[PDB]
């Protein structure tokens, strides 16, 4: 298992470079569409390790084709310069009837045909295999999601970026066991994990906040099934988007190395 860390803010550069030197992480995952106006070589020369791409705001399910194609073309050039280990994106609902959601929605998995055709279009534009991430479900779409992602992967050739803590959120919120994802876990090389919070008015509902140390049930999940997660070429990105504190991150990075040793 390689261990990664996600790079989203430029102000965290010195810290991420420190984690690379101290061998705390082995690759960096760019939230790459935050940086499409940088010279691509400047990013490649900033990280002394492989990189991987995570795309947040392509909105490929809804964006008009011309703006989508321009973003794809720019990203294709970034793919040539940096050769990311993988390229990944999301299945998210951003806009209801022209109104932007500020807490992003879970798509209805009954809409397979719509998602299938949009995924094929976007994967085609990127020119490489695309990996698609699972959603930290609150409502009961969590029960539909594993079967949906397996079908989608079969028919379009995308991979699944399996976020273990999003699935633990889904399990805590809906009852949908993380074991539903076993087949996907034994297939994909590429993983996410992070801490999660709670809804302010209901501690039993879990929010995917990436602002906190990994929970105990997320750690048992990874440890219980370490042989299903770990593979040739397997990677796991630790996500920390808020309270980006060097020492708390190092605790979580070390705990991942405790679970997935180097030899």
């Amino acid at each position: 298992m390689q261990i990664g860390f996600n790079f989203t803010l430029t102000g965290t550069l010195d810290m991420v470079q420190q984690m690379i030197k101290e061998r705390k992480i082995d690759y960096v995952e760019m939230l790459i569409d935050n940086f499409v106006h940088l010279p691509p070589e400047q990013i490649a020369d900033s990280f002394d390790c492989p990189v991987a791409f995570h795309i947040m705001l392509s909105k490929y399910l809804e964006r008009d084709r011309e703006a989508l194609a321009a973003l794809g073309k720019r990203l294709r050039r970034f793919i040539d310069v940096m050769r990311p280990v993988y390229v990944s994106d999301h299945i998210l609902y951003f806009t209801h009837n022209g109104r932007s959601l500020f807490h992003l929605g879970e798509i209805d998995y009954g809409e397979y045909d719509h998602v299938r055709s949009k995924v094929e279009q976007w994967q085609d534009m990127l020119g490489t295999r695309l990996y698609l991430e699972n959603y930290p479900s609150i409502m009961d779409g969590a029960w539909d999601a594993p079967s949906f992602y397996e079908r989608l992967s079969r028919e379009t050739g995308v991979g699944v970026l399996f976020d273990a803590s999003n699935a633990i959120c889904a399990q805590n919120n809906t009852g949908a066991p993380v074991e539903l994802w076993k087949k996907i876990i034994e297939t994909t090389r590429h993983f996410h994990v992070a801490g999660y919070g709670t809804a302010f008015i209901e501690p039993r509902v879990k929010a995917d906040t990436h602002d906190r140390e990994m929970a105990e049930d997320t750690l048992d999940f990874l440890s219980r099934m370490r042989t299903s997660f770990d593979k040739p070429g397997a990677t796991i990105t630790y996500e920390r988007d808020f309270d980006i504190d060097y020492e708390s991150i190092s605790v979580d990075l070390k705990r991942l190395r405790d679970i997935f040793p180097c030899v």
Binding site: P39, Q42, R63, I107
Partner: protein, 194 residues
């Protein structure tokens, strides 16, 4: 132990109510849909007031006297909650019970917040800067520039003075976009989207 999804099942059932504080009560309080909507409402609340804390001096700490009527007014005028979100809160304030207490100290934070949101979430490859103008900010503008270097220590939003007078916008606010990172043309103000 789990909370019942109650009269609904999936997120798509709730989409229409995710930004509507008035219809939240229609879901049972012990239900998951009530919680789901509440996480969404709080995202809107914290996006507005964490970024522009001085607005809470107007409303008081709960923010209710701005947030509830503004969210109702946003649905009424079919606002998009795009990058111009903060600017539209200021427009609402200008016709509100708080209209007398607006000054430059409330204005510049909301202009910075909108230029910041634009440069963080806009994905038009061909637009590198937004330029924001205001009838209450004569001869200056707020410019939000996308990051083009990993090694910048300047803030991505700046206030810039013009040497040649700038036309006041028709509305309270106006904007234009630039390709690349210079202002070598004034095309005239565009009105706020939506």
């Amino acid at each position: 132990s789990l909370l019942p999804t109650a009269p609904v099942r999936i997120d798509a059932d709730l989409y229409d109510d995710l930004a509507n504080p008035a219809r939240q009560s229609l879901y049972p309080r012990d239900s998951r849909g009530f919680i789901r909507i509440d996480i969404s409402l709080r995202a809107y609340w914290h996006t507005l007031f964490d970024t522009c804390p001085r607005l809470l001096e107007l409303s008081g700490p709960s923010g209710g006297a701005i947030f509830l009527p503004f969210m109702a007014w946003a649905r009424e005028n079919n606002l998009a909650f795009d990058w111009s979100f903060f600017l539209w809160v200021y427009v609402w304030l200008q016709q509100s019970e708080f209209r007398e207490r607006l000054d430059e100290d409330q204005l510049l934070p909301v202009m910075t917040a909108s230029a910041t949101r634009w440069l963080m979430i806009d994905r038009d490859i061909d637009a590198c800067q937004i330029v924001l103008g205001s009838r209450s900010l004569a001869g200056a503008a707020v410019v939000g520039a996308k990051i083009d270097s990993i090694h910048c220590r300047l803030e991505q939003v700046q206030q810039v003075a013009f040497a040649a007078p700038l036309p006041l916008p028709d509305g309270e606010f106006g904007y234009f976009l630039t390709p690349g990172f210079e202002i070598d043309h004034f095309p005239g103000w565009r009105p706020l989207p939506r």
